Amino acid sequence: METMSEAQPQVISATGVVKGIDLESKKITIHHDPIAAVNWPEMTMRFTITPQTKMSEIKTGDKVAFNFVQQGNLSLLQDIKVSQ
Numbered sequence: 001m002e003t004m005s006e007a008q009p010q011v012i013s014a015t016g017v018v019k020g021i022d023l024e025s026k027k028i029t030i031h032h033d034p035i036a037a038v039n040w041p042e043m044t045m046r047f048t049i050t051p052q053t054k055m056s057e058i059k060t061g062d063k064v065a066f067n068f069v070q071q072g073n074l075s076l077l078q079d080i081k082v083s084q
Contacts, residue, residue, distance in 0.1 A: 011067050011069055012067065012069065013037075013067050014032050014033065014065075015032065015033045015064065015065050015066070016030040016033055016063070017030065017061065017063055018030055019031050019044055021058065026048055026049040027047065027048060027049065028049060030045060030064065045075065047068055047075045047076075047077050050076050053076075053077040056082070058081070066081075067079050
C-alpha cells in the first residue's frame with residue numbers, strides 16, 4: 001500500500017448552530033450535527049476564520065451550513081452561511 005501524500009486538505013461540509021462569534025480572535029463556536037467524514041459526533045467546536053473565509057451575515061442562534069479544512073492543527077472555515 002502506497003503511503004505518499006499530496007497533503008491537500010479535503011473540504012468537509014457540516015451544519016450546526018452558531019453559539020459564539022469572535023471576529024477579532026477569528027473564532028466561530030458552532031454546535032454542529034455529526035460529521036461522518038471525520039468521525040465526529042454532535043459537539044460544540046471552535047472553527048477558525050481566515051482572511052479568505054467567505055463570510056456572510058450570521059449571528060448567535062442561526063442554523064448554518066459551513067465548509068472547513070483540517071490544516072495546521074486548526075479547522076479553517078472556507079465559507080459559512082445561514083441554512084435551512
